[PDB]
């Protein structure tokens with residue numbers, strides 16, 4: 264059998280070009296080379312408070328968007344997290360092998376706490392442990408994620424090693440698969456802050472389901488720098504906005520940084536923003552054209568969730584049975 | 597019938613104070629209420645312990661509760677890990693529980709020890725629980741469960757019952773043998789307590805060593821302030837035999853504390869004979885214990901699945917196919 268790939272995304276907010284290039288692009292390319300399992304993590308999404316109707320719609324939006332990117336249901340397992348009970352079951356067990364200090368020092372908890380001061384809930388604090396359960400359930404070898412999830416992934420490795428040291432080879436120790444380009448896609452009007460899928464200022468974001476014409480106007484108004492003459496060169500410290508635009512172009516087209524610098528030799532930020540606007544608009548037009556065809560076909564979406572949760576439960580139950588045997592519970596019969 | 601929920605830890609060796617107190621109280625109320633006993637193996641793992649002893653202790657606790665008089669036909673009795681819904685609801689309730697609330701409960705500690713009160717709330721709220729018997733140490737945990745229930749209900753309508761504490765205490769007093777001011781608790785000093793599995797010889801040894809007083813002449817009379825040791829032995833004997841305190845004072849008229857101790861040891865062992873006989877018979881019947889665990893999990897999961905479905909429908913999750 265092939266090595267196993269696992270990853271997930273929250274059905275909350277509107278998934279961006281950041282979410283695509285950091286995770287979903289890699290998900291589609293790994294499907295033949297590895298046995299891939301992709302999850303709509305609705306149990307994680309509710310750590311930030313959601314409208315009930317908006318959550319349900321977002322789950323089905325996210326599933327249709329996976330399919331629009333090229334996530335084949337005949338190649339990969341595609342499921343909703345809450346449909347497999349073993350994620351919560353293993354999650355509780357892994358709380359008992361996760362330290363308090365590890366969770367409190369997490370960057371995602373600190374930033375999300377400051378952002379949602381009125382709802383610093385226990386789920387938001389306990390986010391990483393359920394994520395470790397999501398990965399460890401399927402004997403996962405590779406985990407394709409963006410730069411922001413590096414810390415959470417290191418904990419999953421530490422938990423897997425900590426549990427295996429006491430009980431034997433029950434889990435596989437997962438490894439990160441973070442890409443070279445597009446691992447940390449930044450905000451258009453604030454290049455130092457990463458692109459959010461629920462930004463209060465919409466002008467920071469390039470949404471995947473967003474109107475192409477609106478996205479072109481956003482790329483044109485992206486902040487750059489005061490350099491005289493203007494020069495298209497990758498430099499995150501000095502030229503954060505220009506570098507973010509180069510990073511976005513490189514990932515859509517496939518061309519490298521020095522290739523693009525040579526292409527924009529003797530050119531200025533008009534040529535740069537024109538190429539990003541054209542490249543990104545053609546991507547989103549093609550993607551949204553496939554999306555609605557998937558999203559309005561409810562019988563098809565229902566079948567994908569049905570088959571995916573069924574495939575996932577087989578893997579999940581086997582791992583949880585071994586966990587429960589090792590920690591010393593009386594086996595269910 | 598109101599629904600009652602009790603979490604039974606698979607770790608401690610139950611005492612006669614546990615038995616004659618709350619447990620014997622509840623054995624006779626199994627037709628009055630819908631009693632649910634959950635052996636909480638998922639709570640146990642918050643403290644790191646040997647795996648094989650945990651599996652043993654779960655079956656020990658199951659057999660002992662069954663031996664004490666819990667009826668699988670009348671009451672639902674099950675292992676916590678056999679019902680996935682506990683873990684499922686517990687994660688949901690994490691998202692509607694403040695971080696501040698858990699930190700306000702009175703680095704190197706594991707996240708389970710920090711977060712078990714939310715699981716403890718899910719344990720109760722899954723079964724539409726009306727009454728929850730608790731000690732002083734678990735009063736804060738019940739209060740959180742009620743706050744979570746009201747918080748969730750206020751957003752999404754009446755999904756959960758707001759549970760109440762079961763107020764009335766047992767009536768049987770059982771204090772520690774070498775410290776009669778202190779209540780007998782399943783204690784580091786094991787000569788303070790009488791376990792339910794102890795043979796007659798061990799009961800004679802512990803009751804003999806139990807403190808009394810230096811009254812001259814020695815007089816068997818009830819007095820908690822002055823004669824704490826002698827009073828505890830009378831309450832133990834009264835709890836076993838059902839005789840009143842004034843009757844026993846007349847029964848031990850002109851009698852020394854050696855006579856009292858002899859009767860207390862005989863009486864307690866007489867109670868523990870029928871109890872231990874039932875324990876060892878149930879504990880070593882593997883098919884019987886497996887059938888009780890299957891039926892109880894099946895009864896529990898029917899209740900639990902209905903509540904979780906209403907919770908999941910209210911939160912807005914896409915329903916399982």
Ligand SMILES: Nc1ncnc2c1ncn2[C@@H]1O[C@H](COP(=O)(O)OC(=O)[C@@H](N)Cc2c[nH]c3ccccc23)[C@@H](O)[C@H]1O
Pocket residue numbers: 269270271272273274281282283284285286304307393394397398406407408409410411412445446447448449457458459
């Ligand atoms: N500005 C950005 N630039 C580049 N990449 C980004 C940007 N923002 C987000 N990402 C990546 O997109 C994925 C989805 O993020 P979510 O917030 O939906 O969701 C998350 O951040 C995960 N915790 C969901 C999850 C739950 N369980 C798991 C198990 C394995 C892997 C992932 C998961 C992520 O891979 C994230 O790294």
Ligand SMILES: COc1ccc(C(C)=O)cc1
Pocket residue numbers: 351352353354355358389392393682683684685686687690711714715718
């Ligand atoms: C890490 O996932 C978790 C799963 C379950 C719980 C409960 C039962 O409170 C908490 C956390």
